[PDB]
Each structure stands twice: as C-alpha cells, then as structure tokens.
C-alpha cells in the first residue's frame, strides 16, 4: 500500500541554560530526510536531491531567512524560559524495592533485583553493595525505561551466590532525593 | 543544563491525518487536537503553567497539507517501503495481586505514523480503561507510540497487545502474564 | 486622529488565485506576491520604514484555500450572480501636449475579484509602460482596481481602456482623448 508523508521536526538544543542555543529543523518525505536548517549555518541545506528546490527557493527570500534565524530567540529561548518554571525543575521520587529470583536453574537463588520505579528525571544511580563493598561486576540492567507519562522505571540486578551472614544493599541516588536511598537484603 | 525541545508536525496520506506536538527531553508536553481544534496537555498540571493558541498549529498543518501535494509530484514514483514497528509490553509499576496496575504497550521505530492497536484480555477486546499518546518523534525519522490499559492483577488471566501496521504481514501480538 | 488599517485576503475558484494585502486610509500599503513569496510595497519608500514576513500571509491563504472547500459544501448551490464593474478613465495630472502623462483606468464595485484589462492606443494593445494594483477592498463586499498607462499627449491620438468581467455581456470599453 502506497503512503505519502510530509513530516517536520524543529529541534531546539540547549547547552548550559539558554547560554548556548541551536535550532535544528529537519524535513522528511516518507523515510528520507531531504532538507534541513542549521541555526549555526544560517540557511537551508538540502540533504538529498528532493530537497534542493526548497533550499534554493527558501534561501532566496532574505525576509524569510531573517525570520528563521530569529526563531532561536523567538521560539527556542522564548519557550525555554516558560518550561524552565515546571519542566526543568520537575521531580518525582522513585519507589525502591528489592527481591530475589532464579532466572536460571534453581535451588537457593542467584539473581538479586533492585526495582526502581516511577521517578523523574531520568538520570539516576543504582549501586549494589556486598557487606559494604560495591559490586562492580555481575550487574545486569533493563535500562532506563521511559513510560511516556513523564516517569521512568528500571531494574538493576546482581548475580550472586548468597552466603548466610552477608547483607546486600541497593543504593539509589537521584536529584529528587536529599540523601541516597538504601534497601538491604 | 542539557535539554531538548522538539516541535513535531506532519500530514499523512491517504489517511488524511495530521499532527502537531511538543516534546521536552523525550516526553510529550502536549499536542493539538486537529479535529477539536484544542490543546491537549500530556499531564493536567501543565495547563496551569502555560498556554498555546491552537489555530496556529492548524495553520501549519494546512501548510503541510499543500506541501505534501508538491512533494508527491516533485518525486514522481517516490513512495516505496515502510518500517514495521517493534512492540514491547510491560507493567508500569511493580505488580502486586489485587492492586490495580497499568499495562504499557510500547510501539517503536516505525513509519508511516499510523497503527491499529487492540488490547486483549483473555483473548477479548478491551475498550474501557485504556489510553494512548499521539505519535512521538525519535532521534531519527521514525515514530514511537504508547498505549495503556488498566487491569486487575490475577494469576489466571493473560493479556495481549495487538498491533497492525502496513509493514506487517499479519497482525502482531505481544503477550503478557503475571508472575510472582 | 481618524485612521483605518485594513488587512484583506482571499482565495478564489476556479481561478485558483489568492491575495493578501494591507490598506491605510483607502490606499494600498503593500501586498504579498503569492507566487514569488515576497512583499511588494505600493511605494518604494515604504520598505525603509517597515518589514513583513511573507510566509505568514501564505499560511493564511492556505487556510482560506481549505476554508473555501468547506464553504462550498456548506452552502450547497450557493453560487449565483456577480457584480459587473464600473469603469472610468482619466489623466493622473493636468494634460499638456508633449509632456509625458499617465492614464488611469479605474475599475470599481465588482466581484469576483478578477478582470481582463487591456490598454488600447488608436485601437492597439499597449503592453509596455503600463502597471496595475491588486484588488483593493471597499466599504462593502466588492473590489476596486487601478490600471495605468504612460503616454505622450497628442491631439490626434485616442485611447481606450478595455475591461472584461464575468458580469459583462461583452467587453467594456472606455474611451479618452486629449482636449485643450
């Protein structure tokens, strides 16, 4: 079945606040990106043949090209200042829970799971400790799962053969936490 | 500070569907209901901190409507293949029997941006207690999309996420069951 | 102070023509060249005191393109009659033999906004040394439009302004000759 798609992404990239801003407009037609507009370039740049006409036509409109370059201020900067009020500063504490599993054969247990869910933003640290010593190998992660509803979740597992007398402790550090959370097992 | 603000829009055909939306660090801030000509915040809370005039976006789409006609002739036999989606289903939060939870059906890397998703409980079509996001953008030229379903954890029930796409031979079907 | 600032735009069919322009106290400040996607000042001088982003206007027209399709079905057999234009021809400034002057062909109160005007010198089609304004708005729902022709005053030559419109049975033809 034949489908035809005109799509456009207008990316605003922010480095250290509004300090460094950079627009990035990218046009596609179906699966092919055929044109783009780099703020630090100043004008349209075809990316494929099908994107030439527009670059030539749109580039010959100094009034228009005046506007685009403006957008880094008009839109990017503009909107950043608005979002800066609740988006940039948004924080949701993660719910930390631990528990064992088999994952393989069985009898005893060899997979210790630290489940960290419902948190924001995405940057976070989850460390595993055996009797006070950090486990740097034998870690398995599910990665940073984005739920699309502005909250993440993840699992950080430790491969281990539990020796009675040993206390395992998951450590979780996150911007929404004053002090790193811990959970022992 | 390291942040990204993406404004994505598009128009499709034959489907005759358009979209306009804003993304902040990989999450939807809101989109515009073409039909209803209104702004839809991805989270209620967002409305009290901002505002947007939807006719603006509608304009842009009209733009894109026309642009696409141009693009179709400009290419001459440009259409071709599409990208089937990868689907993954999993619980939103730790699953505890009896405690209401949410199943997330995550549709990734595909285009055109149009799908037919269906939630299946014990092989049955669930249409109540479900939600979905518009098509979200990726680092590339493909889209991503979330589907949700509220449910009551049980050891005896099973769930399926059925996704249909042009790039699919036959409907795709991702399964999911509770495990203690 | 008593002033008026009018912004007029429209899209026509079948003709498939659109317009966008600004008026200040009955005079054109400028309009937007749909085709060339550029701003045309009615007087050179105006550019140095202002600026306008033409893609904006183009947007609006796209809007109006769509709107018209809606309006056509919404009415169902709405079309009907039109308004023939009143034409008047006269000199721009006192006429003195030998001294270059300008003939103005003033087309008034008509719609749809589309005409076929032709300058005639001794029955001959003049296409050099002529100019015209877009369609201007009136206090009502009809349009006005100017046509110009540069000429060399002579006691033996005669001029005609030939206007054609849908509301006309046959081409209209206004005459003009010098008189001392």
């Amino acid at each position: 079945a034949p489908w035809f798609l005109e799509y456009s992404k207008s990316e605003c990239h922010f480095y250290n606040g509004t300090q460094r801003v950079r627009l990035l407009v990218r046009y596609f037609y179906n699966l092919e990106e055929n044109l783009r507009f780099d703020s630090d370039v100043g004008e349209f740049r075809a990316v494929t043949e099908l994107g030439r006409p527009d670059a030539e036509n749109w580039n010959s409109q100094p009034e228009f090209l005046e506007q685009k370059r403006a957008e880094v201020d008009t839109v990017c900067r503009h909107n950043y200042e608005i979002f800066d009020n609740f988006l940039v500063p948004r924080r949701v504490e993660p719910t930390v829970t631990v528990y064992p599993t088999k994952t393989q054969p069985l009898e005893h247990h060899n997979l210790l799971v630290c489940s960290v869910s419902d948190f924001y933003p995405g940057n976070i640290e989850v460390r595993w400790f055996r009797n006070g010593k950090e486990e740097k190998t034998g870690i398995v992660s599910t990665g940073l799962v984005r739920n699309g509803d502005w909250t993440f979740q993840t699992l950080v597992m430790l491969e281990t053969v539990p020796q009675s007398g040993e206390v395992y402790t998951c450590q979780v550090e996150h911007p929404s936490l004053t002090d790193p959370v811990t959970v022992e097992w | 500070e390291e942040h990204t603000i993406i404004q994505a829009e598009f128009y499709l055909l034959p489907d005759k569907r358009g979209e306009f939306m804003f993304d902040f660090d990989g999450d939807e801030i809101f989109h515009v209901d073409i039909e209803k000509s209104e702004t839809i915040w991805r989270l209620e809370e967002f409305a009290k901190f901002a505002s947007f005039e939807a006719q603006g976006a509608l304009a842009n789409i009209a733009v894109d409507k026309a642009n696409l006609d141009v693009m179709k002739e400009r290419s001459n036999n440009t259409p071709d293949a599409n990208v089937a989606p990868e689907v993954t289903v999993l619980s939103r939060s730790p699953v505890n029997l009896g405690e209401p939870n949410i199943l997330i059906c995550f549709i990734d890397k595909f285009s055109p941006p149009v799908v037919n998703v269906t939630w299946l409980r014990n092989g049955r079509p669930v249409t109540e207690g479900v939600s979905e996001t518009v098509f979200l953008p990726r680092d590339d030229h493909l889209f991503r999309k979330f589907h949700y379903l509220t449910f009551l954890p049980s050891t005896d029930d099973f769930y399926d996420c059925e996704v249909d796409h042009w790039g699919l031979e036959e409907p795709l079907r991702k399964h999911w069951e509770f495990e203690e | 102070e008593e002033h008026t600032i009018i912004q007029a735009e429209f899209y026509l069919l079948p003709d498939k023509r659109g317009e966008f322009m600004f008026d200040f106290d009955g005079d054109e400040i400028f309009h937007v060249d749909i085709e060339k996607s550029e701003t045309i000042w009615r007087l050179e001088e105006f550019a140095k005191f202002a600026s306008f982003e033409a893609q904006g206007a183009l947007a609006n027209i796209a809007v109006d393109k769509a709107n018209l399709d809606v309006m056509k079905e919404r009415s169902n057999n709405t079309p009907d009659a039109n308004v023939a234009p009143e034409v008047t021809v006269l000199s721009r400034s006192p006429v003195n033999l030998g001294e270059p002057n300008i003939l103005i062909c003033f087309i008034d109160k008509f719609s749809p906004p589309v005409v076929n005007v032709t300058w005639l010198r001794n029955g001959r089609p003049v296409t050099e040394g002529v100019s015209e304004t877009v369609f201007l708005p009136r206090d009502d729902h009809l349009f006005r439009k100017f046509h110009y022709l540069t000429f060399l005053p002579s006691t033996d030559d005669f001029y005609d302004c030939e206007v054609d419109h849908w509301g006309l049975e046959e081409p209209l033809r206004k005459h003009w000759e010098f008189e001392e």
Binding site: V75 | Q7, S51, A57, V70 | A62
Partner: peptide, 13 residues
Amino acid sequence: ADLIAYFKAATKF
C-alpha cells in the same frame, strides 16, 4: 504561564 510560540511552516512551491 506565557504562551508557547511555534514555528511558521513554509510553502513548498
């Protein structure tokens, strides 16, 4: 709660 500005698309002739 100021307005969220967008990007005026363009017409592809």
